[model samples]
Target: PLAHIFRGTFVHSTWTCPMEVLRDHLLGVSDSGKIVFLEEASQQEKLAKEWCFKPCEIRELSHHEFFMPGLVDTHIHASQYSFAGSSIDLPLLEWLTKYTFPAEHRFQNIDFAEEVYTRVVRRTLKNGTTTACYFATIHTDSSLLLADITDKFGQRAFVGKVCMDLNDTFPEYKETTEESIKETERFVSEMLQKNYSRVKPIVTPRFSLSCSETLMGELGNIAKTRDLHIQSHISENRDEVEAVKNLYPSYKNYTSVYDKNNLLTNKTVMAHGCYLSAEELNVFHERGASIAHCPNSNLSLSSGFLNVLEVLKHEVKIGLGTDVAGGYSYSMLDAIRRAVMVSNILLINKVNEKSLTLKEVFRLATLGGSQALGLDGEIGNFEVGKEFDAILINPKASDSPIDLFYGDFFGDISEAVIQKFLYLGDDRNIEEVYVGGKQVVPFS
Candidate 1:
């Protein structure tokens, strides 16, 4: 029998459908957080008896309130939130040295780390990001604290202690290969011991340009031994790609550098494949690796936007990422809008491709993102047995930026209200957030 049940409109994605809108559906959630059953509201009597609940006991949703699967931020920098929405004008290479590294280096102070870390996690959650893949700074102490903050806030996440050794541009922040590996091991070992319910450690290589071959290889081995999730950057900018070619003279391509180091695996997610070829995408598909399509950062830093259609055509798993500081805007809502614009830019350039639709983009932010992080089987959608990670959206929230009209919603739960919520809404409309069936946005 289930402990809680809700009757409402449940929106999510599936294998064949990008977005599936279920209206007047009944969902049962178990005590352990899994979805017990999902059926039409017409089955009220049958479900009430089968699930051992009374009709009055069932929580019925308001007409304008619906549940959408929580947004998944496949790539975000918790250490960079203090600078998010600013200092984003420079290109990728110069940006890292002039703004990124120096700011990250400041995270050596735990006080500064906690304030920014707490704000980023809380903000992401309030904006409906139930699952986030975070990149923390090199300091293992502050990096672990970021994970601790996320676990405390109840956001499901993979926190990576950024690993790098070849930061000649920002020499002060770089680490020795041995020290990087040892500290990463200590971080992972301690993180594992803590066993936070919804947070885990990820092996991060900080992209090939900044990391030595030895550092990449060791991080790969650590991930393999511990069976952990791995994340990093690849082919984000044109100059960056050429620089990688000059740096790693032996490698055939940028993707091969990581692949040869054993970093490309089923559990890996590399951000920003804007310059990758179709051949490299096949390698990603082969290894079951995924890409975090950070269109906002790509376009914001003049780094280059990802051709998401081509990525999908290649059958590579892809998701959306805010890629803050470089991208600006911590909200995934901004990420979605930027992605739409990037696709439009490609169309404007006459790329002769089918542009992305809102439904597809919505899926990328939710189910596609979950798939990218290898969490689709657990929390992407409200499927039977999946965890109930969701956002209760009230489009008519008086304080909402959205202004509803008679034409917006006429019949039973019009999608116009939903679309408006997605296109024009902010955190104001997100009244409640749930991660694994536990409410967290209101802070308990």
Candidate 2:
């Protein structure tokens, strides 16, 4: 059985603030993987007596260590993982045509699909991404293979088989409207039948430009009927936005293209939103939809910066996304870093008076992401009844890049330590990763 008792420093977010750092805390996880108790270390005796756990069962953390909720990647392309860290020479549409479609088309081979899918899952898990929302290609068998790979690795995920009825740019990668709907239904049923506890299938419609109104409506109907989650792109680039406007002149704006088709639901997660107007953001807020802010991809592709503060003021939920190949880094730590840089750029350009702080982006990378995925009740923080999805960080881990000074070790400096980790740390500092209280990284 997994160790049910843990005594250490715990860091997480609360409803009122971006981060709540609890030092010397005692947390209990049931054998079934749910968090049953969380209290200060001072309450250990009472907790032990009430929970019927022995003192010897406690797993203690060193002073250099602390626990944080596992990072949640709100958007990532599993199919594009094969080309991550390279191929950033073109804009969004051109890039998709010149490189993305060709690479995705190759996934029709199960052997190739398994190779890339296995690598992406293992890579993200090793980097401490416990929960990831993944976009696979339109190939149903291969997409199913991605889900199976994720479950095999014990990573919590929402997998989507990309849907698009039109592919003028790459005909080889496109599916017929009827085939798209049929394959999506088949994909959902097959995924559900697998009974993977931590992995679920999401409805994906590529984006508005690639999907016809009829196709989007059918997908929306399937989502509503199945009570499934939906993921797609929205307003990532100026040309893309204009193309959407031209493609759907009947709609008021780009957002309405999806809204009119019944695709904008509470479970929807739209990537980018770099050009969405305040009016459009209000719609997102009203409909309870969330945005996956892909900063690195935006900057890399020269897409405009999303006014995150504006989104926050509109009361829309926002989280970070790696966006894989377009992003150039699979590390959510990179997302956090770029999120701050983008906010700083906004401030530098006088768009906002205040830039987002590390604490705020940290919350976005974890709790905000969980909220975006509608999984906060299950995995976000250290609250009782939530699963303990967390990463164990030792800033002083061997060969770590971070240099912890003596002065950095004093009173409540755990906060500073976390800051250092945010700015300077990498996978080398993440000693262990756990999803649903089960250690999944370091591969047992």
Candidate 3:
């Protein structure tokens, strides 16, 4: 039933199929430390020939360039996938109340969750996001449904149930402090019982503004005792930060609220720290806590640019998040390209300077994201023995061979492929996507 072997132009000139790239070569279904090459050249070719019969299998790509790895989106809300581009007018708080809450409320129905979750996972797989850190809604059953759907699609994901204790404008979604903790405990235990290795439980506090101090401290306890990863928002808007400061006058700044609650650990991921103060940055650097750069979402909501260059300067691990719906695009390349453009906009706005590069952008989408998600050793490269999780693109998907050839005189093949994928390429360029050595997209 399986073709067993595949051959393509080894895009990375420095390495071949048998050479180790990141952790190991792409040869196995599991995390094997060993590398294996086909014993005979004829046998390899035969296997490759067999693979050509598969659906959406192309014999050759115009510029089959390989890069560091497939990306890991450390922050994305699957429940919000359907709301893209519709809620950009409101700020974070109002947007949550006006559109997000009502839309999320629909997911409480298991059938609805199943349909939407399936679409989201399929779209994500099609985009070549191998590992995604996801946030589901407050409904425990729906959260479990989302996890089950992702697992069924063979995605490596960390999905969590959003928790809120106070200031929940939605009456149906709101819960008292004790009720919130009880629900979270139940949600976490259910996820642990499933114990799906690829799908783990992450503690999600909606944000400092929506979550009470007591609830956040309890969440911190869960994080410390269970060693769970925490996900939430922080300093995305000026008004929200001011509201948080006024709400918790005792804290030093926006990040200090989580820090005071003992929730700012290395395992914690705070999305969109675009408006973070100097002290907040220092604390994040000191604690080894990371940020998720949702560049498109920031711009979509008129939020300020995240100084990702400065964040890297602090050497804190950071990853790209689609922040879907709010972000306006699901493709991580879109996120990556937007990160580069948004960084330039920030530089021009702040000091009339420009210094971002394509390499740095790709790194954020690949190795940097892997490091942020603690998955660097497993998935971020086209190595000899690593899991075969990859996305392939064809540069000549648009324009004629003459055009790409002419473009190559000005840029490398890899550069041309990336530039086209970022600017001109679409879903059609996604020749294939593989997860854990299994083809999940273009499956007939």
Per-candidate Cα lDDT values, in order, are 0.91, 0.93, 0.73
| TM, every model | 0.98, 0.98, 0.85
Instruction: Give candidate 3 misplaced runs (Cα > 4 Å).
Output: 1-68, 350-352, 397-403, 409-414
| Candidate 3 residue-wise lDDT, 1-444, digit = tens | 332343443322121231222211222223332223322233544544543334233233233443234567878889988776566888777888898888888887888888878888888877778789898988888998888887788788989888876754777776788987888889889888997857788899989887888999998998888889988999998888888989999988888889989889988888999988666788888987888899988988887788887787777778888998788788887888898888888777874356567666766776677767766666666555556666666655444232345655365464554555556666666667767666666754
Clashing pairs in 1: none
Q: What count of clashes does model 3 give?
A: 10
Which candidate do you rate higher for lDDT, 1 or 3? 1
**Candidate 1 accuracy as TM-score:** 0.98
lDDT (10s digit) by residue, model 2, range 1-444: 435788899989977889998889999888888989899999988987788878888999998899999999999999999999999889999999998999999999999999999999999999999999999999999999999999999999999999988888888889999999999999999999999999999999999988999999999999999999999999999999999888899999988999989899999999999999999999999999999999999999888899999999999988899999889999999999999999999999999999999999999999999999999899878999999899999999999989998778776665778899999999999999999988998895
Question: By lDDT, highest first, what's the ranking?
Answer: 2, 1, 3
List, residue by residue over 1-444, the lDDT tens digit for candidate 1: 576799999988888997898999999999899999999999999988887888888889997799999999999999999888888889999999999999999998999999999999999999999999999999999999999998899999999999989888879998999999999999999998998998999999999988888899999999999999999999999999999999998999999999999999999999999999999999999999999989879988999979899999999999999888788988888888888889999999988456898888999999999999999999888899999999999988878899988887776654788789888999999999999988889776
lDDT of 3: 0.73
lDDT at residue 167 of model 2 (Cα atoms): 87
